[PDB]
Amino acid sequence: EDAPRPPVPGEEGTPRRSDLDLGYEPEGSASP
Amino acid sequence: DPSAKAVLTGEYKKDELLEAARSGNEEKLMALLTPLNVNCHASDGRKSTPLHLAAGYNRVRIVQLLLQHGADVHAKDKGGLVPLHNACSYGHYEVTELLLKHGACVNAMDLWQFTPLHEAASKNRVEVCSLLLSHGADPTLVNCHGKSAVDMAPTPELRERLTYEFKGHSLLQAAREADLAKVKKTLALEIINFKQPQSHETALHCAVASLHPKRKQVAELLLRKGANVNEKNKDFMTPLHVAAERAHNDVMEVLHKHGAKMNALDSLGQTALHRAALAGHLQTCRLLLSYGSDPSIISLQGFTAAQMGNEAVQQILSES
Amino acid sequence: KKDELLEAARSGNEEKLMALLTPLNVNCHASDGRKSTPLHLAAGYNRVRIVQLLLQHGADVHAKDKGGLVPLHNACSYGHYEVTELLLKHGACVNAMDLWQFTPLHEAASKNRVEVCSLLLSHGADPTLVNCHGKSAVDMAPTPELRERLTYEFKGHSLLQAAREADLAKVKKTLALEIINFKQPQSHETALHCAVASLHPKRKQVAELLLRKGANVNEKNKDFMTPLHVAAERAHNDVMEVLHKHGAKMNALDSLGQTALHRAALAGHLQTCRLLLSYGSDPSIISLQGFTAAQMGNEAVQQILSE
C-alpha cells in the first residue's frame, strides 16, 4: 500500500557509511 | 424517513456493541449481540469488528461468546488485520490459543504483509511467539518492507528462539507427515558429523585421539548424539584406526559397542589391527582380536599384522 | 618512483614491479589516499602473482593502511580466495583489527564472500568478535543463509576443538541447539514420537533416518510414553521393528506403570502383541492399577499371551 500503517487496536495486560564514523573500505575491487 | 432512522438506530447499537466488546462488558454484549451485528464494523479508523477489539483488549470471555454466536474468526479490518493479529500484537496468550482453536490462520497477512508473528516478535511477546511457532507460524516471511519476524525481533535471544523453534516445529511437522525430504532438509545443518574441511575428521575422530581423561565419556556422548562410528577421514582412517594406533583402549571398547567395523581398511590397506601391531600395542591387539579383527588381512605393502609386529605381538596373533 | 611501484602492484604489472622493487621500498606506503602498501594493493586487486613476489621479497603481512587495515582485509573484502590463502600461509593474523575493530571476517561476511568466510573460519576466525558498534561478522552477513552457514561452521569448528580436549561440558554447550531431539514445548514429543504415530507411508524410513541422526529411542513424552508405546497402541508394526533394531527398551513403563504390551493388549492388537513378545516384552509386568496385559485384554489377546 505504501501509505503509513495505522497502529493495531488493543493494549497490553569510499567511507563505509556516509552517515556515521565506521571507517573506510579497503582498497581493491571484486573485479579489477 | 423509516429506512434512514433504522440505519441510524442500528449504527448506535453497533457502536455500543463494539464498546461492550472493547471493555469486556458481557451483560451489555449479550444484550446487544444479534445475528445482524455479530460481524459489524466500526465506522471510523480501522473499522474493527467486535472480535478484533475483544482480541486486542484481552477480553477472553467476550471472545468465547462472540465465537459461540457466529463471529467470523477470519474477519478483516480496513488494513486487512484478522483478530489473531490483535491478540498477538498485545501478547494475549489465552485469546491467541482460543482463536487458533477456532481455525485462525497462523500466517494471515494484512495489507502490508504483516503476519501475527511479525506483531508478536516486533513487540517482544516471547510466549506468544512460541505458541504461534507451535501452530506453524513462519518467521522468515517478509512484509512489504522486506522484513521477517526474525528481522523485527528486538533482542538477539528472541531472534535465536524464533529460528530454533521454527526449525524444531518444522522437523516435528515433517515427521508427522512422514515427509522424508523435509526431514532431511531440516537436519541438513546438524553439527554432530561436521567434518574438518581439510582432513575430513569428525568430533568422534578428535575425541578418540584425545589424551584428556574424559575421552571415553566424550566419545560415548558423541555416539549417543548421532556420531557415525565408522566415518573415514581423508586417509580412510575410522575412529577405530585412530584409537588403535595410540592404544586408547577405553574408547576402542565403546566403538566396538556401537558397531565399529573391525576390518575397515585405511588408504594403505591396513586394519586397526595392523596399526596396533606396528606400534607394539599388546593389549590393543588382544582386544581387537577378541572383537573379531581378521589377522590374515594383507596390507597394500604386502604385510599381515604379524609380519609388522614384534615378538610379543606375533605370539598374541598366532593364538587368535 | 614509489608511486610507480605502487601502480605496478595495483595494475598487476610484474615486469615493472620487479624492476623497481628493492629491500628498501617493499613496505613503502602511498603518501596520500589510504596510504596502502604494495601488498595491500596487490591483495585488494587480486594480483596473485604480485602477492607471491612481494611475500618472497620481504613484504610485511602486518603492515597497516591509514585506518589500520592489513592486506588480509583487502583480500577478504573483495573475495580473493587464493590471495587470502597465500596471506594466511605467510602468517597473516586472522583477527587483525582496523581502528573500528573490523576484522577480515567482518569484511568478507558483510560483502557476502561465502567461501572466503569459510576459509577464515577454518583458520580460527571468530564470527562473534564485535566491531566498535557491537556488531559481529554474523550480524553483518546480509542473508539468513550466510548467517546460518557462519554459525554452522563456527559451531562445527568449536565442537571439534572441544572434542580434542575431551571437554564434556563444552561439547554439550556447542550441541545445545541440535534439533534432532527438539521437544514439543507442552506435549514433550520429539520427532521420533511424531514419526511413529504418522499415518503416512514413509514413516518407517523417517523413523530410521531420525534414529541414525541421533534421536533418543526411549524418549518420554508428557505421559512418560516412549515411541514404542505410541507405535504399539496404534499397531504401527513397521516402526516398532525399527525401534527394536535401535535398542528400544521393550519394558519401559508409562505413567500408569504400563508397557507397550499393556497398550497393545488393551487396544486388542493381536499381531502387535505377538511381535512385542517376540522382541522380549514381559507379559508378567503388573501396572500401577494392578493389571497384567492379559487382564486388560480380550480372549484373543489372552490366547496370544499364552502361545
Written as one string, the DSSP assignment of C10-61 is HHT-HHHHHHH--TTTTT---SSTT---HHHHHHHTT-HHHHHHHHHTT--T
> In 3D, which of C183, C180, C212 has the Cα closest to residue C204?
C212
What are the angstrom distances between the C-alpha of B118 and each of B46, B213, C81? 18, 49, 38
Round to whole Å and give the CA distance between C214 and B316.
37
CATH 1.25.40.20 assigned to domain C176-306? The reply is yes
Residue A21, min C-alpha distance to chain C (Å): 9
Written as one string, the DSSP assignment of chain B is -HHHHHHHHHHHHHHHHHHHHHHT-HHHHHHH--TTTTT---SSTT---HHHHHHHTT-HHHHHHHHHTT--TT---TT---HHHHHHHTT-HHHHHHHHHTT--TT---TT---HHHHHHHTT-HHHHHHHHHTT--TT---TTS--HHHH-SSHHHHHHHHHHHHHHHHHHHHHTT-HHHHHHHTTT--TT---TTT---HHHHHHH--STTHHHHHHHHHHTT--TT---TT---HHHHHHHTT-HHHHHHHHHTT--TT---TTS--HHHHHHHHT-HHHHHHHHHTT--TTPPPTTS--HHHHS-HHHHHHHHH-
> In 3D, which of C99, C88, C84 has the Cα closest to residue C34?
C99
Resolution in A: 2.0
Phi/psi of residue C57, each to 5°?
A: -105, 30
**C-alpha count within 13 angstroms, C-beta hemisphere, residue C209:** 21
Residue B152, min C-alpha distance to chain C (Å): 14
Round to whole Å and give the CA distance between B132 and B129.
5
* Partners of C130 in beta bridges: C136
Of chain A, the end-to-end C-alpha distance in Å amounts to 42
Interface test mutation site (partner A, options C73, C78, C98, C116, max chain A beta carbons within 10 A): C78
Nearest CA in chain A to C73: A26
Residue C131, min C-alpha distance to chain A (Å): 9
Nearest CA in chain C to B183: C206
Residue in C44, C99, C102 nearest the CB of A27? C44
Residue C227, min C-alpha distance to chain B (Å): 13
Round to whole Å and give the CA distance between C214 and B187.
11
Superfamily per CATH, domain B1-187: Ankyrin repeat-containing domain (1.25.40.20)
Q: CB contact, 8 Å: A10 with chain B?
A: yes
Nearest CA in chain B to C199: B177
Contact A5 B119 (CB under 8 A): no
Residue in C43, C73, C79 nearest the CB of A30? C79
Written as one string, the DSSP assignment of C166-181 is T-HHHHHHHTTT-STT
Q: CB contact, 8 Å: A19 with chain C?
A: no
Residue in B90, B111, B112 nearest the CB of A11? B90
Interface test mutation site (partner B, options A1, A8, A11, A12, max chain B beta carbons within 10 A): A8
3 state SS of A23: coil
Round to whole Å and give the CA distance between B254 and C30.
62
Round to whole Å and give the CA distance between C189 and C212.
18
Chain A neighbours (≥3 Cβ pairs under 8 A) are B, C
Helix axes C299-306, C270-278, angle to 10 degrees: 20
Contact B87 A12 (CB under 8 A): no
3 state SS of C194: helix
- Name the residue type at position B175: A
- Do the beta carbons of residue B241 and residue B266 sit within 8 Å? yes
> In 3D, which of C268, C249, C261, C250 has the Cα closest to residue C286?
C261
Place of cell 566396538: B256
CB-CB neighbours of B273 under 10 Å: 30
Annotate A5-16 with three-state secondary structure. CCCCCCCCCCEC
Round to whole Å and give the CA distance between C222 and B112.
40
Of chain B, the end-to-end C-alpha distance in Å amounts to 111
> In 3D, which of C262, C250, C251, C252 has the Cα closest to residue C287?
C262
Is C176-306 the same fold as C1-175? yes
CA B109-B115-B120 angle, 5° bins: 160
The number of angstroms, rounded, from the C-alpha of B226 to the middle of its chain's C-alpha atoms is: 16
DSSP C133: T
Output the CA torsion B179→B180→B186→B187 (10° steps): 150
Contacts of C191 in chain B (CB under 8 A): 171-172, 174-175, 183
Q: CB contact, 8 Å: C100 with chain A?
A: yes
- Name the residue type at position C198: S
Round to whole Å and give the CA distance between B111 and B43.
19
Round to whole Å and give the CA distance between B245 and C65.
49
* Partners of C23 in beta bridges: none
> In 3D, which of B69, B47, B58, B72 has the Cα closest to residue B21?
B58
* CATH placement of domain C1-175: 1.25.40.20
Q: CB contact, 8 Å: B103 with chain C?
A: no
Residue in B58, B86, B112 nearest the CB of A9? B86
CB-CB neighbours of C275 under 10 Å: 20
Sign of CA dihedral B133, B139, B141, B145: positive
Residue C25, min C-alpha distance to chain A (Å): 19
The set of residues, in sequence order, having a beta carbon less than 8 Å from that of B15 and lying 6+ positions away, is: B42, B43
- Do the beta carbons of residue C81 and residue C115 sit within 8 Å? yes
Round to whole Å and give the CA distance between C65 and C77.
14
* CATH placement of domain B188-318: 1.25.40.20
Residue in B48, B91, B92 nearest the CB of A9? B48
What are the respective helix, strand and coil percentages of chain A, to the nearest 5?
Answer: 0, 5, 95
Residue A18, min C-alpha distance to chain C (Å): 15
**C-alpha count within 13 angstroms, C-beta hemisphere, residue B86:** 32
Round to whole Å and give the CA distance between B140 and B115.
11
- Do the beta carbons of residue B178 and residue C201 sit within 8 Å? yes
Q: Is B146 left (phi over 0), alpha (psi -120 to 50) or beta?
A: left
Over its C-alpha atoms, chain C yields an Rg (Å, rounded) of 32
The set of residues, in sequence order, having a beta carbon less than 8 Å from that of C146 and lying 6+ positions away, is: C109, C112, C114, C117
Residue A24, min C-alpha distance to chain C (Å): 7
CA B17-B22-B24 angle, 5° bins: 90
The number of angstroms, rounded, from the C-alpha of B10 to the middle of its chain's C-alpha atoms is: 50
Contact B56 A9 (CB under 8 A): yes
> Where exactly are the structural domains of chain C?
1-175, 176-306
DSSP H helical ranges for chain C: 2-11, 14-20, 38-44, 48-56, 71-77, 81-89, 104-110, 114-122, 137-140, 144-164, 168-174, 191-197, 203-212, 227-233, 237-245, 260-267, 270-278, 299-306
Cell numbers placing C76: 577478504
Cell numbers placing B119: 506483531
Round to whole Å and give the CA distance between C47 and A27.
13
- Do the beta carbons of residue C96 and residue C62 sit within 8 Å? yes
Q: Between A and C, how many CB-CB pairs are < 8 A?
A: 53
Which residues in A1-32 are b (16+ Cβ under 10 Å) and which e? Answer: eeeebeebbbeeeeeeeeeeeebbbbbbeeee
CA C44-C49-C52 angle, 5° bins: 90
> In 3D, which of B243, B308, B315 has the Cα closest to residue B274?
B308
Phi/psi of residue C136, each to 5°?
A: -85, 170
